[PDB]
Amino acid sequence: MVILGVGYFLLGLILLYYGSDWFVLGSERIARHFNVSNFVIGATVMAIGTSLPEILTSAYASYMHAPGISIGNAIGSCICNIGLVLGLSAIISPIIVDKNLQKNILVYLLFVIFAAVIGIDGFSWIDGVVLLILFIIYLRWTVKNGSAKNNPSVVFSLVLLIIGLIGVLVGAELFVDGAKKIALALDISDKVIGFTLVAFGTSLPELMVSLAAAKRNLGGMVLGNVIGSNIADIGGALAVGSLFMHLPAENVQMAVLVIMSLLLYLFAKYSKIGRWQGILFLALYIIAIASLRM
C-alpha cells in the first residue's frame, strides 16, 4: 500500500515523460499533414486533449454541489498555464510571435476580459452557454486562419498522437492517485492539500506537453497549447461547471488572470516571449501561490 503508491507515482511520471513527447511529435506530424500551423494544432487538439481532466473535474465537482472547486480548478489552471507552464517554456525556448498569432492572442485577451466582466457576480448556466459558444467560434476561426486512402505516415502520426495523449492522461492520474495513496499510507492526509494535488494534477498534461514541445523548439505549439487550454478551461471546463450550478465569483483570481493575459499579449505584440518574460511569469506565479486563499 505504501509503495503501491510510489509504484503508481513513478510510473505516472514515466508515462508523462514519454507520453508527452509522443503526443508532441504526433501533433507536429498531424499539423504538417493538415497543412496547419503548430499553433493551430496546439490550440485545438492538444489544448482540448490536455484540458479533459479540467472539464471532467469541473463538471463532477459542480454536479456534487461543490461549485467553488469547479471554478477554482478552472481559473487556477489558467493562471498556472501562463505563470508556470509558459514561464518555464519561454526560458527554455524563446518565442518571437508573428503578426498573425498576435491577432489570436488579442482575441484570447478579449475573451478573458469578457469572462471576467460577466463573472463579477458569478457564472450562471447562461454564462456557460455563452462562453461555450464563443469557445466553439474561437476554434473554427483559429483553424481557418491557420489552414491551407491510408498512408502509413498519417496512420503512424495518429497513433503517436493518441497513445501519447493516453500516456499523459493516464500518467497524470497515476501520479495523483500514487501521491494520495502515499499520503494516506503515511497519514499526512489533509485534503486541504488534496484539492491542491488534483488541481495541479489536472495541469500536469499541459506542463509536460509544453516542456516537451519547448525542448524541441516548437514555440508556436507551446503558445497554442497555453492559449487554447485557457480558453478550453473557461469556455469548456468553467462553462460546463455553470450548467450544473451557479459558480461563485472568483474576482481576485480573474483579475490575476486578466493581468497575466494582458502581459502575455503585450510581450507577444511589442517584444518577445523569452528568458526575462519567462522569469517574470514564474515570479508572478510564485507570488500567486504564496498569497491566494487556498
DSSP symbols for 54-68: HHHHHHHHHHTT-HH
Q: Which residue has the cell 498512408?
A: 151
Phi and psi, residue 74, nearest 5°: -65, -55
Residue 201 beta carbon to Cl ion: minimum distance, rounded to whole angstroms: 28
**Neighbouring residues of 233: CB distance < 8 A, sequence distance ≥ 6:** 51, 54, 74, 75, 77, 78, 81
Report yes or no: 136 and 259 within 8 Å, Cβ to Cβ: no
Binding to ligand MYS (CB under 6 A) within 125-144 occurs at: 125, 129
- Give which of 216, 227, 218, 210 is closest to 101, Cα–Cα: 227
Check binding of 47 to Na ion (CB under 5 A).
yes
Q: Binding residues for Na ion, how many (CB under 5 A)?
A: 9
Q: Between 42 and 83, whose beta carbon lies closer to ligand MYS? A: 83
Nearer to ligand MYS by C-beta: 18 or 125? 125
Q: Which residue is nearest to ligand MYS (CB)?
A: 284
Binding of Cl ion by 42 (CB under 5 A):
no
294 touches ligand MYS (CB under 6 A): no
Mask 200-219, x = binds Cl ion (CB under 5 A)?
A: ------------------x-
Residues 229-288 that bind ligand MYS (CB under 6 A): 243, 252, 256, 284, 287-288
Question: What residues contact 10, with CB distance under 8 A and at least 6 apart?
Answer: 178
Residue from 27, 38, 93, 277 binding Cl ion (CB under 5 A): 38
Tell me: does residue 278 bind Na ion (CB under 5 A).
no
Query: Which helix (H) or strand (E) segment is 123 a member of?
Result: none
Contact present, 238 and 62 (Cβ < 8 Å): no
Q: How far, CA to CA in Å, does 164 sit from each of 12, 151, 160, 177, 206?
A: 13, 20, 6, 20, 13
CB closer to Cl ion, 67 vs 220? 220
> Taking CB under 5 A as the rule, does residue 101 contact Cl ion?
no
Q: 198 to 257, contacts with Na ion by CB under 5 A?
A: 202, 205-206, 229
For residue 205, the partner it binds in Na ion, ligand MYS, Cl ion, none, with Cβ less than 5 to 8 A by kind, is Na ion
Task: Give least dist CB 87 to ligand MYS, A.
Answer: 12
Classify residue 58 as exposed, middle or buried by CB count within 10 Å of its CB (0-12, 13-18, 19+).
buried
User: Could you tell me the smallest distance in angstroms from the CB atom of residue 240 to ligand MYS?
Assistant: 7
Q: Which residues of the chain form contacts with Na ion (CB under 5 A)?
A: 47, 50-51, 53-54, 202, 205-206, 229
Q: Which residues of the chain form contacts with Cl ion (CB under 5 A)?
A: 38, 218, 220
